Design a binder for this molecule. Sequence first.
Ligand SMILES: COc1ccc2c(c1)cc(C(=O)NS(=O)(=O)c1ccc(C)cn1)n2CC(=O)O
Ligand SMILES: COc1ccc2c(c1)cc(C(=O)NS(=O)(=O)c1ccc(C)cn1)n2CC(=O)O
Ligand SMILES: COc1ccc2c(c1)cc(C(=O)NS(=O)(=O)c1ccc(C)cn1)n2CC(=O)O
Lengths: 288, 278
Amino acid sequence: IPAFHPGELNVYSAPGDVADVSRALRLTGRRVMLVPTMGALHEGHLALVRAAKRVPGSVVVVSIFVNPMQFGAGGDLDAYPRTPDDDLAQLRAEGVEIAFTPTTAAMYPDGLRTTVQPGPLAAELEGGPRPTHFAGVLTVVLKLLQIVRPDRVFFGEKDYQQLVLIRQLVADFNLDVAVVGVPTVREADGLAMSSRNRYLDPAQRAAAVALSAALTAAAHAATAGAQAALDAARAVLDAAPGVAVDYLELRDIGLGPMPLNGSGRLLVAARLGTTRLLDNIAIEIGTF
Amino acid sequence: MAIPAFHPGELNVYSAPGDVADVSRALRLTGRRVMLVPTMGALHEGHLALVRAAKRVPGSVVVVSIFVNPMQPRTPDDDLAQLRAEGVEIAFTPTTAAMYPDGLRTTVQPGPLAAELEGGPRPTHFAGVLTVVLKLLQIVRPDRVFFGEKDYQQLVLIRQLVADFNLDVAVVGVPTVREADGLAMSSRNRYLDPAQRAAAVALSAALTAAAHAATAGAQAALDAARAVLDAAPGVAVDYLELRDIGLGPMPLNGSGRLLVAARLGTTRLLDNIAIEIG
Ligand SMILES: COc1ccc2c(c1)cc(C(=O)NS(=O)(=O)c1ccc(C)cn1)n2CC(=O)O
Ligand SMILES: COc1ccc2c(c1)cc(C(=O)NS(=O)(=O)c1ccc(C)cn1)n2CC(=O)O
Ligand SMILES: COc1ccc2c(c1)cc(C(=O)NS(=O)(=O)c1ccc(C)cn1)n2CC(=O)O
């Protein structure tokens, strides 16, 4: 197996290297935590790391890999933010002991061949206009899970549909990992942290507060019912300059084929210029 | 918190995925090497060859799963009696509901090989197989998993599954058990009437003739196989293909595999063989 220096940041690119180190660590009683990311790390990612660090006897593995298979033609893959130096600097500051930074060739030596086919949820919301997006996400997450074999894996709640689908992956394939969702870290005004907030100009940044404002307004309006919650959120979004709403939907918490009962999730996606922002919030109807 | 009961040297039967997972993990922690032999019950000498192969790994515990995948005949007490006779210590016998508690949802999509050969008549067959095999591997977490070479395309797809999803299991292909005249063992053989059973030997006879003709080249090999199949009545050949060992195009020289499938009455039979072209 390769070298592992505790208390320091060990960076591996070969899947076999991280697999060997992970398995060796687990066999000595350390529990392995995975935080899989596409890099361009921000305090929200750091919240995931800190959650992982809190598990007694944990060793934390952070993966950074911009996965080509969840993008389609149109420039999105090339445009994805890449800040490798800041990423690794942040991991050192947080006391992370393992970064896993695979090459595209190491992950996809045979190109696209066997893949994960998600359930019907993948064709809705974010997946509506992007039919293969979630198949790309679930395929890479499955791979990272098999390479690293963590005890627990950590995701932010901002991409809530992705998190739900990942829970479906884990249940449906009987994966022996616990999925931990971490509540969304926010800027002071309430804006959900995102690696894509950097693409908001000052005017768009100002207007972007409307998403979180709309969601929180709805969460409080919800004592008066679903229609009131939805209309409160719509009013706020409508009052906001240059916010073009793509959807605003209130669903059951698992987003699945069942109606809303008392507990729901309200999800929003909107464009500000060319920048697509997402946010979501827990909703209790009538209310709790 | 307690591990389900496991009595070493006896046949331990578990229908709950969580139970087999817990026992396999406990065994793994005590040093035993976990071997998995997936089956659909109605065990025959082929399945016993897989068991025996698994058994000879030192420190092995053998898990035989018995599950009829609706996504891709049963003798419950006889199957278990057979496994007991082979010294198998774990049988995993889940229900459809236990394997699919949330119904059909996330599944495995095979690569384009699944559309070829057997994927012609059954375009979704291999997605079913790969899905259940993945689940079985995740429930049991064996060090090694054993499959017959009879369903060679299936075997190749499994190796692709393991490679593509970075699974930490060793895939072991076990040579096809055959009847005395060479007919590959299969649950379907008993349906053949005497004329069909006699005609069915043409599959293995064709492939072995090809394997030996191969010193004279690829074309001689294929022509020899075709001639033998052409000598049999009521054998409707669906395909006869020479491929490389991973089922891509056959290279000009080197190792390959010759695969055949044919219908005799309503029974579809398959066979395949190693071929070397120098
Ligand atoms: C509803 O409109 C569409 C339009 C195009 C679509 C689909 C649906 C579904 C596929 C598809 O499953 N392609 S794939 O098997 O090659 C593949 C690609 C990428 C990843 C991650 C997983 N699997 N495709 C693309 C296609 O057919 O070529
Ligand atoms: C706990 O506070 C938060 C708050 C916001 C967060 C996170 C944590 C983590 C992400 C994030 O992105 N993670 S990811 O690198 O695995 C990824 C990348 C791309 C796509 C499609 C989905 N997921 N984010 C949101 C963000 O950057 O937009
Ligand atoms: C080492 O030599 C051999 C020789 C022949 C073999 C095997 C091994 C394994 C099988 C086999 O398929 N097992 S199965 O659990 O996938 C199955 C059983 C019954 C039905 C109906 C469908 N699927 N067979 C052939 C066979 O039974 O058809």
